[PDB]
Each structure stands twice: as C-alpha cells, then as structure tokens.
Design a protein around this ligand. Structure first.
Ligand SMILES: *[C@@H]1O[C@H](CO)[C@@H](O[C@@H]2O[C@H](CO)[C@@H](O[C@@H]3O[C@H](CO[C@H]4O[C@H](CO)[C@@H](O)[C@H](O[C@H]5O[C@H](CO)[C@@H](O)[C@H](O)[C@@H]5O)[C@@H]4O)[C@@H](O)[C@H](O)[C@@H]3O)[C@H](O)[C@H]2NC(C)=O)[C@H](O)[C@H]1NC(C)=O
Ligand SMILES: *[C@@H]1O[C@H](CO)[C@@H](O[C@@H]2O[C@H](CO)[C@@H](O)[C@H](O)[C@H]2NC(C)=O)[C@H](O)[C@H]1NC(C)=O
Ligand SMILES: OC[C@H]1O[C@@](CO)(O[C@H]2O[C@H](CO)[C@@H](O)[C@H](O)[C@H]2O)[C@@H](O)[C@@H]1O
Ligand SMILES: *[C@@H]1O[C@H](CO)[C@@H](O)[C@H](O)[C@H]1NC(C)=O
Ligand code: NA
Ligand code: NA
Ligand SMILES: [Zn+2]
Ligand SMILES: [Zn+2]
Ligand SMILES: [Zn+2]
Ligand SMILES: [Zn+2]
Length: 537
C-alpha cells in the first residue's frame, strides 16, 4: 500500500518526476508538461509527460509530447518553456541532448491547433536553433533551460538560456525577429561570479502596486509602473533565488535594485525543499502562477521500493509586496474548493507556557489549517544574539525543546497520538539590534522528530518573516500525507518540507497547536478544513 502518496498534490501514477515543463494556458485550458522517467523511480530516459486541467487542481493524463526521436534530442528531452505568440499560437523551446552529448536548444510546435489538449507536437528539422560551438565558446555541458520568450519595443524577440563559464553563472540572451533565426547577443542579460551553474532561469515583469499579473512582453501603460524579476536555480546549492530590479531595454541588461545580488544571498521563493521553479501568465484571471518541484526526502532505496519519486507543489499566485522588497506567494484559490463543507473552528483559546491543543474532527493527514496568534507583551521578547544572521541556523541550533521569551509557538502537524512523531512549524520573536522599535520574526519547520525511520532527510528549514508582531501573526499549512507547505505572514515566507512518518498516517495522524515559550500566547482564531482528494494522473 501507499501511505505517503499525496491526496491532492500533483504527481504521476508511478515513478520518477522532475522539473515542471512549459506551463501555459491555451484556448481556456491549462497545460502542464514535466520531466518523467517512463520506466524507473530514479532519473533516466527522460521525456516530456503531459497533463491538462481547467482549474489547476484536477489533472487529466495524455501520452508524452516530447521524447527522443531525432538527432537534436536523441539522448534526452530536458526542461524548457512555452511562449504564446501574439496570434495565440503556442510554441515550446526545450533542451535536447545530441549525438555528441551537447545541450542544444530545440523548437517544437503543435500539430493540430484545433485540438485544445495539444496532444501531438512536431519538431522543426531545422533544430537546433541554438547550439554551442567553436565561435561562441559556450560550455556544451552547461547550456540548458530556455525561458518564456518576450518581444521588445524594437520588434525583436529576446530569450535567455541558463549557463556557466568557470564558476561564473550567466543568463545568455538571444535575439530573433521571426522566432526561427536566433542570434546570440554579445553580452548576457546578467551574470554572477562565484555561484555555479545558472539553471532554470526565469524573467518576468510585475506591477509596483497590485495583486494582478503582468503579461511577459508588456511594457506597461504610460501610467502603470513596472519592475522586473530575474529568478535562477543554483545547481551548487540546489535552491531557487530571485532578485527584483529594472530591465534596461536599451543596453538589454537586467539591473537589480540597490541591495540585491544575484547569488546565494538573494531572497528565495521557498526556504525548504523547492527547485526548478517556473512561472506563466494566466490570461483567464490576470495572475502569475508559480510551479515548483519538490523531490523526495526519503532514501533512494525507499523510492524504488514504493515505485515513485517526486511531487509537484500546489501552484502559487505571485505578486510584488507593497514595500517593493520581496515577492508574495499564495496557493491558487482553486485549492480551497477541496475543503469539506464541515470546518473545525477554534477561537480565543490561551496556550500557556508548555501547552498543547489538539484539533479534533479533521482528516489530519490531508487538511488545510489557518492560525492567528496574538502576542501579549512585546518587551518580554529576547534580544537577538549579535552574529545570528542565517535563519536556518537558528532553527537547528535550538529545537522546540529550547525556549525563548516569545516562542516556540505554532503548529505540530502529522503527529502520532502520544507524540513519538511530529513535524513542528513555529514562530520565534526577537528584538532587533537597531536603535528603533524593530522586531525579528522567525519561522521554522523542524522535522528532526518527524519520523521514527532513521535514514530520512531530517533537515530543518528556516526563514525570517517581514511582518509586525504588533498585529496578529498569520500561519497556514497545507497537509498532504508526506508533504507540508507552511505559509507565514500571508505568504511573505514559504517553507515546503517532506515527511515520511511511520506512525502518523491516515486515521492515526493528529494535529496540534502549541507553545513552549516562557510567556503565554493567545490563539485569536483557528480554522481546520478536511481536504478532499483530487483527480490527478
Ligand atoms: C533531493 O532530495 C535529497 C534528499 O532529501 C536532497 O539531498 C540532501 O540535501 C540535504 C540538504 O538540503 C542534505 O541533508 C543534510 O544536510 C545537512 C547539512 O548540514 C548542515 O545543516 C544545517 C544547515 O544547512 C546545520 O544545522 C548544520 O550546521 C552544523 O554544521 C556546520 C558545519 O558544517 C556548522 O555551522 C555547525 O557546526 C553546525 O553544528 C550543517 O551546516 C545536515 O542536516 C546533514 O549533514 C545532511 O547531510 C544532504 O546533503 C542531501 N542528501 C543526499 C541524499 O545527498 C537534495 O538536495 C534534493 N535535490 C533537489 C534538486 O532539491
Ligand atoms: C563546463 O561544464 C562542465 C559541467 O559542469 C564542467 O565539467 C565538470 O567539472 C566539475 C568540476 O567542478 C566536475 O564535477 C566534473 O569534472 C565535470 N562534470 C561533468 C559531469 O561534466 C566543466 O569544467 C565546464 N568547463 C568550463 C570551461 O566552464
Ligand atoms: O531533467 C534535467 C533537468 O533538471 C535540471 C534541474 O532540475 O537539472 C538536473 O539534472 C541535470 C542533468 O542530470 C543535473 O546536472 C543537475 O544536477 C540537476 O539539477 C535541469 O537543469 C535540467 O533541465
Ligand atoms: C484536429 O482536431 C480537430 C478537433 O478535435 C479534429 O476535428 C480534426 O480532425 C483535426 N484536424 C485534422 C484535419 O487532422
Ligand atoms: Na519559450
Ligand atoms: Na488565485
Ligand atoms: Zn477533467
Ligand atoms: Zn526549467
Ligand atoms: Zn542550502
Ligand atoms: Zn551574546
């Protein structure tokens, strides 16, 4: 049986899944391709598997669209993106592995534009459109993951491909005026020395104030003020980072805001298990949607034993925060449809020092839970230790057993009856070292005690939240058997973790709200929703 298969998260019926590939919307239908091993629970024989939806939650299967069948992709069909041409026509640019094991860029387009499921795709015998050679001097073994392409104000298409040269990450930009003949621009859009391979790049605009998404090609109105986000997947650190800045269309370079740097010190989308992110414009609801890949935290032996590996996070809506400092993410509202009509609700309850409160009457391994925490006296908070800068290091140096003035308080999810197994998601509040009344809010996802099985990835994840602890603290968790997605400060901080409990499964799982800090905290409001399964394949 399968106690770790997700109820409502996207995953194939069996075996290895990888990056999300070319997400898009065509003729009112959502499309999601992905890297898949059609015959193994490890990486290998990789092809573009294909599924579709009308709500981004329930998915219908289709035979693999892009698979090795030609010289330009004979040894593999790696990640890529989908562009929607101004005439509504969709195209895919993807990385193929050639007879010499070189990473080359191939175009593919639909065979029957009237088929709204876009079942079969044809490849141009002119592929590769973009390839390494002796004159460009591009590293043949690191030249992959082409982005969604944008059209500039000089009627020329621009697209970037992630690469590297001697420990220098760079986003190589190409230009075309017909989307068939692509010439390499003399200089990259951006680069960074020190950070390794610049995998899964992404480049998209956002409005300075608003929740609504922006079309990729858009220059905006004469009244609408725009900023740009460059996102990259660092292969060295295995994380996804982004910076916010301005797109100099003259010099064709990306200039990050004052303070940002495009390396391992940039903001992340998710401070847990989260890789190879890709966005697309959803013209139906005028929103930008983020897809992310979460790989398995269990041993490889366990993966082949259960016969599958890798799930996809429930899609997030993304926009720019009012303060302009960071991006905000929130699970697409369609997921809220899976909530049972019945809803367990608790309000105005006081968790005193070293206390717990079980949430009764919910399917505790497949649920959605939202908490509001009110702190009583803010000057009871401890002052942050001078050289405490890495939020992940705070959460691992001091577990739930080590107490602060304020914190740990939050949720204990996927928990056994007598608490032999629990995954804790909590807050800690410190005073900042500054002269003013500034506070540091910490959000941890501790999975050191998450499973009795010894050889699982027990790594603890951590993040700072940009919220004011004068106001009530917001925490949300989507729980799905082996995956939990934690959301702090209304999507200002996101943590995904993977848990494989030996006791806390299905009927036997529990849910707790807790507090181990010196001072008691108020639970202003608490709502738990049992979650229905989704029709995915
Ligand atoms: C796909 O999934 C696999 C499996 O889940 C992923 O591979 C594993 O990745 C994780 C990291 O994400 C690694 O697991 C552990 O790594 C930890 C590294 O040790 C540090 O952990 C904390 C900070 O990161 C911190 O508590 C600790 O500090 C202590 O030591 C420091 C000196 O090093 C120093 O600051 C102090 O002395 C302090 O006491 C460490 O810095 C750790 O928990 C374990 O060591 C463990 O290795 C593994 O490397 C990976 N496991 C495998 C299977 O290789 C993989 O990333 C995923 N891939 C993708 C694409 O997402
Ligand atoms: C081009 O990229 C390849 C692939 O990363 C580099 O070769 C790797 O070098 C690293 C050393 O850090 C080692 O892991 C292996 O020796 C190589 N990996 C594989 C699987 O090929 C190569 O050094 C790069 N060359 C240049 C000039 O940038
Ligand atoms: O399917 C390959 C696809 O995955 C990415 C990012 O997840 O890279 C992974 O696979 C590469 C080839 O095996 C590895 O070099 C790399 O370490 C790993 O992250 C994309 O780069 C690629 O398109
Ligand atoms: C394309 O798909 C449409 C709609 O499903 C179908 O009617 C038609 O036969 C296909 N086009 C051709 C002529 O192959
Ligand atoms: Na594209
Ligand atoms: Na939404
Ligand atoms: Zn359907
Ligand atoms: Zn990609
Ligand atoms: Zn790391
Ligand atoms: Zn000290």
């Amino acid at each position: 049986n399968q106690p770790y298969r997700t109820g409502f998260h996207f995953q194939p019926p069996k075996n290895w899944m990888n990056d999300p590939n070319g997400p898009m919307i065509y003729k009112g239908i959502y499309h999601l391709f992905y890297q898949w091993n059609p015959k193994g629970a490890v990486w290998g024989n990789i092809v573009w598997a294909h599924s579709t939806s009308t709500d981004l939650i329930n998915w219908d299967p289709h035979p693999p669209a892009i698979f090795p069948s030609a010289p330009f992709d004979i040894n593999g069909c790696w990640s890529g993106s989908a562009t929607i041409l101004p005439n509504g026509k969709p195209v895919i640019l993807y990385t193929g592995i050639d007879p010499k094991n070189q990473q080359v860029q191939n175009i593919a387009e639909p065979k029957n534009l009237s088929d709204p499921y876009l079942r079969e795709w044809k490849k141009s015998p002119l592929n590769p459109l973009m390839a390494p050679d002796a004159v460009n001097g591009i590293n043949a073994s690191s030249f992959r993951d082409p982005t969604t392409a944008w059209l500039g104000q000089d009627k020329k298409w621009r697209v970037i491909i992630g690469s590297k040269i001697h420990r220098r990450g760079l986003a190589i930009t190409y230009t075309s005026k017909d989307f068939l003949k692509w010439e390499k621009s003399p200089e990259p859009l951006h680069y960074d020395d020190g950070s390794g391979m610049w995998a899964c790049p992404d480049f998209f605009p956002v409005t300075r104030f608003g929740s609504n998404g922006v079309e990729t090609s858009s220059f905006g109105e004469p009244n609408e003020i725009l900023k740009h986000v460059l996102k990259i997947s660092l292969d060295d650190t295995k994380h996804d980072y982004y910076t916010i800045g301005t797109y100099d269309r003259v010099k064709d370079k990306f200039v990050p805001d004052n303070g940002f740097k495009m390396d391992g010190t940039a903001p992340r989308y998710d401070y847990g298990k989260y890789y190879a992110s890709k966005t697309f414009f959803d013209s139906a609801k005028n929103r930008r949607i983020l897809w992310g890949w979460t790989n398995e935290s269990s041993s490889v032996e366990d993966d082949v034993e259960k016969g599958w590996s890798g799930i996809q996070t429930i899609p997030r809506k993304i926009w720019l925060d009012r303060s302009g400092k960071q991006l905000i993410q929130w699970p697409v509202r369609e997921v809220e449809r899976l909530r049972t009509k019945q809803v367990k609700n608790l309000r105005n309850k006081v968790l005193k020092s070293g206390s717990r409160l079980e949430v009764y009457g919910v399917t505790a391994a497949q649920a959605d839970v939202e908490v509001l925490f009110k702190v009583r006296d803010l000057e009871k908070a401890d002052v942050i230790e001078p050289s405490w800068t890495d939020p992940q290091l705070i959460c691992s140096k001091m577990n739930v057993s080590v107490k602060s003035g304020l914190g740990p308080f939050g949720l204990m999810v996927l928990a056994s009856k007598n608490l032999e197994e629990y995954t804790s998601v909590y807050f800690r509040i410190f005073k900042a070292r500054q002269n003013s009344n500034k506070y540091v809010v910490l959000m941890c996802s501790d999975q050191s005690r998450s499973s009795l099985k010894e050889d699982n990835d027990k790594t603890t994840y951590g993040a700072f939240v940009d919220i004011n602890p004068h106001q009530p603290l917001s925490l949300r968790a989507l729980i799905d058997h082996s995956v939990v997605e934690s959301f702090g400060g209304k999507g200002r901080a996101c943590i995904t973790s993977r848990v494989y409990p030996k006791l806390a499964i299905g009927k036997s799982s529990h849910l707790f709200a807790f507090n181990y800090g010196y001072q008691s905290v108020d639970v202003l409001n608490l709502n738990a929703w049992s979650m229905n399964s989704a029709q995915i394949s």
